Scaffold this motif. Structure first.
Motif: not given
Lengths: 7, 147
Positions: A4, A6, B22, B28, B85, B90-91, B93, B105, B107, B115, B117
């Motif tokens: 992503g 970020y 979550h 990440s 979201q 978002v880091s 997925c 994913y 974030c 972090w 999920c």
């Protein structure tokens, strides 16, 4: 994957 | 999956899902960090429901919308927006090696500074189809970010 936007 | 891409740009891309919930995760990214969070939630819904039955903590029938601007989860029963979201926080997925319908994913949550999920179980599709859609979102997002 994927990786992503970020920062 | 080209149509999937144009859907992401036009706010038309959607998936029937079961929103698992979550979980805190220590990184990440990680294909296994995800697999783990799936196994956690799935083992929680088993811990509860040993005590509370079919009721808790029940995963929630919803629809996942995937746009270049964000991901949204809407409850099928109440049509309430369950998850909003922002796509920019978002880091990572991924689908799931051991659960073929699973998608999650990671974030960043800036208040708690951790972090998080967010796992799903696809209803009619494969985990990888969803992960692909969200990669297309990520892409449109990266493309729009000007210098």
């Amino acid at each position: 994957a994927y990786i992503g936007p970020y920062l | 999956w080209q149509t999937d891409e144009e859907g992401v740009r036009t706010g038309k891309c959607s998936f029937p899902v079961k929103y698992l919930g979550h979980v805190e995760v220590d990184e990440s990214r990680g294909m296994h960090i995800c697999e783990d969070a799936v196994k956690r939630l799935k083992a929680e819904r088993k811990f509860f429901k040993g005590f509370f039955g079919k009721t808790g903590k029940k995963a929630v029938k919803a629809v996942l919308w995937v746009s270049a601007d964000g991901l949204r989860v809407v409850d099928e029963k109440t049509k309430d927006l369950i998850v909003d979201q922002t796509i920019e926080k978002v880091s990572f997925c991924a689908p799931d090696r051991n659960f073929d319908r699973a998608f999650s994913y990671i974030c960043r949550d800036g208040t708690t500074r951790r972090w998080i999920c967010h796992c799903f179980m696809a209803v009619k599709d494969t985990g990888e189809r969803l992960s692909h859609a969200v990669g297309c979102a990520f892409a449109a997002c990266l493309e729009r970010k000007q210098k």
